[PDB]
Amino acid sequence: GKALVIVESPAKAKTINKYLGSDYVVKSSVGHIRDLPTKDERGALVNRMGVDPWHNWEAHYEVLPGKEKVVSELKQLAEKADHIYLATDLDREGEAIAWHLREVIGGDDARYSRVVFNEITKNAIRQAFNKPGELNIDRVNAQQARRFMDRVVGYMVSPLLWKKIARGLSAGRVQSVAVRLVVEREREIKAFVPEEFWEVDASTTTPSGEALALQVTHQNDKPFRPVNKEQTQAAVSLLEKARYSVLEREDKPTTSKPGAPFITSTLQQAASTRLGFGVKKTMMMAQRLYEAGYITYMRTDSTNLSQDAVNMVRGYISDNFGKKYLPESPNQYASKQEAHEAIRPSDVNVMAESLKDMEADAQKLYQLIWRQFVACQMTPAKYDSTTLTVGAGDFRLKARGRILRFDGWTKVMPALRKGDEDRILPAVNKGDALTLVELTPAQHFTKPPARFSEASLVKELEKRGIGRPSTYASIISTIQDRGYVRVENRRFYAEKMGEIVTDRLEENFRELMNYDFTAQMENSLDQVANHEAEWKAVLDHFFSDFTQQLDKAEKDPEEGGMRPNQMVLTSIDCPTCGRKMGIRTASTGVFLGCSGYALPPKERCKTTINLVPENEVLNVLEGEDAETNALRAKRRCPKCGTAMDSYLIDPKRKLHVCGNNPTCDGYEIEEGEFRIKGYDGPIVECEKCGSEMHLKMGRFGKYMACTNEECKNTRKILRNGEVAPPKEDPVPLPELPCEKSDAYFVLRDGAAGVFLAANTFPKSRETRAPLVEEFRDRLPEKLRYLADAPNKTMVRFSRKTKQQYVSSEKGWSAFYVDGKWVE
DNA sequence: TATGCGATTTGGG
Ligand SMILES: [Zn+2]
Ligand SMILES: [Zn+2]
Ligand SMILES: [Zn+2]
Ligand SMILES: [Zn+2]
């Protein structure tokens, strides 16, 4: 008999095992084991959800597939133990995970215990098992409440979106609120218009001291800001024909305090800015550092530091830096006694280089965490700032700089590189004369609002009280690959389906899309977790406000229903029939479709032209002006002035669409001669017709399509422009049915040699290995070597040998050569 | 990468 300890990770199992001996046996349930599924209509709805809002939120949890073997293995080990310790993670999600464990195991409540720890160290684990607590039901309900609200919205708004807007549309309770933020930002940029203005730089020289770079600030006691080449040159020459004199010198002692230790949000931003880590990577690495006992729990909103940790770090600083770097009293940081702690090293003496079994990106993150934690307890840095004001004729120039006098906390956490006002100015004095050397003019433009990064969006979600440290990364992850937004060049871009759905939801679910209300809902869950509210009651108040909104939305758009997807007609003629085309938007994206679709199905034009959006490439990276210049490349709508989106119709026409589509019917067509991605592709002769075959890049790999609109004898594109042999027609088979559809099997040939696949591909997508038994009479060409035949044999393939062989099981195997077969 | 895979190249509103 012994004590059973259950965790959620083998990596977490091995590390906690180092501090548990004798009667403690640990086991890990790899992932979740129990969760929701993944009078007639309503009944089928609750079966799909696994939650009955009309029957007091009765839930029907179902064990996950492929987890049946782990549960039983965990069930067996339980009975062999006297007591059970649930060692899941700190947060509520972990509590709910621990609850699912107790539920599938069984037994009395006193048979279980809930341990809690900020870090996986000898001391911290000892303290956790010293006085284990019970499973907090209030915190579990705070999760299940959230989990239920998330599913209700997801499963009751989505079918409404299909009927009204487009198919394949998903909806999230908080995700729709995050998208709206991106959508709104997108509309601040498109509505913006960069304007031209100029700057001049006069590089001069001190009276035999050094070089002094200046910058014009004023002209005629008025701020100097020309708008074109002409006005500049007018000031340029005038500056050349002038004598430069210093007016004032202001020397001011400045400081810079270090930042607070990391919380989850601040960690993601610093890793994005300094390391270039996305939110997903940052949290993956942090979890690996946590489960290895290197850092504290990475889901936190506290900047608190334990007395031990503070004593630990202050000791290190004293030993390794000296008394100048140690403040008289510990540095305190404001947070949002929570019994929660910042993200920090578990041992300040462990360096990043001393990390075992941690990948490169995990070591970089630790170093980041380590340096911030050490610096957060060191002395402020001191500087000697000097600002110079220089007059020249009817002008007023300026220069600013500083000199490091005490590095302080920056000794352990230095900047990546120099900054703007980090130059060292030569010593001069009021009255000194400067000699002109070089005048440098520069053309600038006004900057539009900066796009969200994955981290800066989180920073915004936290500012508005939207979401929690436990859900920040899931929000960022779950708003992508939905067709609402996308991340390119480490920045968020709003898709058109984003703007459309967002607008729709704002019209029929105003409260659900409200920032403050969404923030209040997070509070209501905290209130449930703190025994200040009952969970089923909160759900009832939510579900009541939800149905009221949903009902009005389900109705027809005349009586307050949700407006259907609009359409903007173009002067574009259908290539199949003869009608004006319209710009419609789907889940997949934007395209052109014939107006001959509203007609009864007897006479509808099912022809569409996929509009391909131009690649917003900031790859040139023209500094912080990259997003600015990317906007200036856009045309302004001839109706509203809003920035337009560019699409390619054909290689001769180019469609510009207003940013406020479909609220603005504005568009333009740029006649020209454009190039597609596969313009430089190879050309080859078709086996059938004899015409040319060009390169098209589809979603299933690059391929060679014939240019004759009568045949489809294609070819596959290999690596580096190579083209495949003239293909081969598949071989069908009678009385060889499948295992899913009413389809039969056909013998194909691919990169994995020769195999056997469905006939209705890809509607079936069913494949198995052809038996040597398993035809031979219908075997085409040289494929008969396998049909020669030798436990029942089956045809295999080897990547190394690049030759096809056969094996058998129920371990026997054999190969072939230029002669025959051998075993 | 230990005897996993392959091949198709719209439709969408
Ligand atoms: Zn109310
Ligand atoms: Zn048509
Ligand atoms: Zn417009
Ligand atoms: Zn052909």
CSV table of N, CA and C and ligand atoms in Angstrom, one decimal, chain A residues 573-581 593-597 604-608, ligand 2:
chain,number,residue,atom,x,y,z
A,573,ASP,N,-18.2,40.9,-66.7
A,573,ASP,CA,-19.2,40.0,-67.4
A,573,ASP,C,-18.8,38.5,-67.1
A,574,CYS,N,-19.8,37.7,-66.9
A,574,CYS,CA,-19.5,36.3,-66.7
A,574,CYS,C,-18.9,35.6,-67.9
A,575,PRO,N,-17.8,34.8,-67.7
A,575,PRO,CA,-17.1,34.2,-68.8
A,575,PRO,C,-17.9,33.0,-69.4
A,576,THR,N,-18.9,32.5,-68.6
A,576,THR,CA,-19.7,31.4,-69.1
A,576,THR,C,-21.0,31.9,-69.8
A,577,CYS,N,-21.8,32.6,-69.0
A,577,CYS,CA,-23.0,33.2,-69.6
A,577,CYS,C,-22.7,34.7,-70.0
A,578,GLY,N,-23.8,35.5,-69.9
A,578,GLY,CA,-23.6,36.9,-70.2
A,578,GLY,C,-24.3,37.8,-69.2
A,579,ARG,N,-23.7,38.0,-68.0
A,579,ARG,CA,-24.3,38.8,-66.9
A,579,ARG,C,-23.3,39.5,-66.1
A,580,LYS,N,-23.7,40.6,-65.4
A,580,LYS,CA,-22.9,41.3,-64.6
A,580,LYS,C,-22.5,40.5,-63.3
A,581,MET,N,-21.3,40.6,-62.9
A,581,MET,CA,-20.8,39.8,-61.8
A,581,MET,C,-20.8,40.6,-60.5
A,593,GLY,N,-18.9,36.2,-58.5
A,593,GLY,CA,-19.9,35.2,-58.9
A,593,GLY,C,-20.9,35.9,-59.7
A,594,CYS,N,-21.4,35.1,-60.7
A,594,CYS,CA,-22.5,35.6,-61.6
A,594,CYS,C,-23.8,35.9,-60.9
A,595,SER,N,-24.4,37.0,-61.3
A,595,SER,CA,-25.7,37.4,-60.7
A,595,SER,C,-26.8,36.4,-61.1
A,596,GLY,N,-26.5,35.6,-62.1
A,596,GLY,CA,-27.4,34.5,-62.4
A,596,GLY,C,-27.3,33.4,-61.4
A,597,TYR,N,-27.7,33.7,-60.2
A,597,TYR,CA,-27.6,32.7,-59.1
A,597,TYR,C,-28.9,32.8,-58.3
A,604,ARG,N,-29.6,28.6,-63.0
A,604,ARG,CA,-28.7,29.3,-62.3
A,604,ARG,C,-27.2,29.1,-62.8
A,605,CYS,N,-26.5,30.2,-62.8
A,605,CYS,CA,-25.1,30.2,-63.2
A,605,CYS,C,-24.2,29.9,-62.0
A,606,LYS,N,-23.7,28.7,-61.9
A,606,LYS,CA,-22.8,28.2,-60.8
A,606,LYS,C,-21.4,28.5,-61.2
A,607,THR,N,-21.1,29.6,-61.8
A,607,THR,CA,-19.7,29.9,-62.2
A,607,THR,C,-19.1,31.0,-61.3
A,608,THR,N,-17.9,30.8,-60.9
A,608,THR,CA,-17.2,31.7,-59.9
A,608,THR,C,-15.8,32.0,-60.4
C,2,ZN,ZN,-22.9,33.6,-65.3
